[PDB]
Design a protein around this nucleic acid. Structure first.
Length: 256
DNA sequence: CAGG
DNA sequence: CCTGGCG
C-alpha cells in the first residue's frame, strides 16, 4: 500500500483555487496534501476549500492577515497535530504543522524568507535552529519523521540555475547552505537526491522576467526523512508541469 | 503598499 | 510579477 504525499507552496490558496487547484487535487489523489504560504485564515476561504471530499482538513494561519500560513488535507486523520516548537515568536506565523500518524510524524513547514532584512535573516536562521532541535528530540525518542515544505534555501550549486550571482543573496548564503549540511549530517536524507542527481531540477521561479519558461529556478522545496526511515521511501519527484503559483508541487511515495 |  | 486596505 503506497502512501502518496504532496507538498506545495501555493502562495495564496484563494488565488490557486481560482486556477483549478481543486480539479488538480481531485485527479492527483494524494493520501496527504501539505500546503504552505496559504495567505488566508480559514474564515476567509471559499467553503469548497474547507470541506473537501474524502479529506480531513487542518489550517494553521498566521496572526498577520493575508500572510504566510500552512494547511494539510488528509484522507486518514492524524492522532494529534502540533502548531509550534514551543517558542512564541516562531509559533505565531502560521509556519508549523506537525501531524502524528502511527508510523511517522509529518512536518509540514513554511521556513522563513531571509531577503527582506538582517532581522528576518536572523529569524530564519534561529527558526532553523528551533526546528532542528525539535526534530532531533522526536527522532531521538525513536520516532520516524517526514519533513516537507519550503526551506527557502537551495542546498548546493546544482540546486539553482544561477549560483555565482546569488552568493550574497539570502537563499544561497554560505550560512544557510551550511545549516542544510548540518541538518543532513544530523541524520536526515534529501529524498529527491536519493533518486535524481541531474541539474535543472527546480521548484521555484521568479514571476519577474518570466523565469519559469526558461527553467531559471531554484529547488527550494524538499522532502526529507530520517536515515532510519529512508528504506521506506519509494519515489521522490517534482511536479514541474503544475501551474498556479511560482512554486510547483513535489511528491513522495512511501510504502508501509 | 508589503512581502517574496 | 503576483498576491493579498483604501475611502
Amino acid at each position: 500500500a503506497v502512501l502518496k504525499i504532496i507538498s506545495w507552496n501555493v502562495n495564496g490558496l484563494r488565488a490557486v483555487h481560482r486556477k483549478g487547484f481543486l480539479k488538480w487535487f481531485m485527479e492527483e489523489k494524494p493520501d496527504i496534501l501539505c500546503l504552505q504560504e496559504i495567505k488566508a485564515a480559514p474564515e476567509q476561504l471559499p467553503r469548497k476549500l474547507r470541506h473537501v471530499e474524502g479529506y480531513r482538513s487542518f489550517f494553521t494561519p498566521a496572526e498577520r492577515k493575508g500572510y504566510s500560513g500552512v494547511a494539510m488535507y488528509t484522507k486518514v486523520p492524524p492522532s494529534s497535530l502540533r502548531e509550534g516548537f514551543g517558542v512564541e515568536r516562531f509559533d505565531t506565523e502560521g509556519r508549523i504543522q506537525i501531524a502524528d500518524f502511527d508510523d511517522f510524524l509529518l512536518y509540514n513547514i513554511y521556513f522563513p524568507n531571509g531577503k527582506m532584512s538582517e532581522e528576518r535573516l536572523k529569524y530564519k536562521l534561529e527558526f532553523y535552529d528551533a526546528f532542528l532541535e525539535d526534530v532531533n528530540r522526536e527522532r531521538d525518542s525513536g520516532r520516524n519523521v517526514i519533513i516537507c515544505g519550503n526551506f527557502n534555501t537551495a542546498h548546493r550549486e546544482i540546486d539553482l540555475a544561477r549560483p555565482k550571482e546569488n552568493s550574497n543573496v539570502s537563499g544561497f548564503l554560505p550560512v544557510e547552505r551550511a545549516w542544510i549540511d548540518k541538518f543532513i549530517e544530523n541524520g536526515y536524507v534529501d529524498t529527491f537526491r536519493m533518486f535524481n542527481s541531474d541539474p535543472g531540477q527546480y521548484t521555484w521561479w521568479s514571476y519577474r522576467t518570466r523565469a519559469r519558461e526558461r527553467n531559471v529556478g531554484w529547488r527550494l522545496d524538499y522532502f526529507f526523512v530520517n536515515e532510519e526511515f529512508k528504506g521506506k521511501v519509494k519515489r521522490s519527484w517534482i511536479l514541474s508541469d503544475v501551474m498556479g503559483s511560482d512554486h510547483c508541487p513535489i511528491g513522495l511515495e512511501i510504502e508501509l
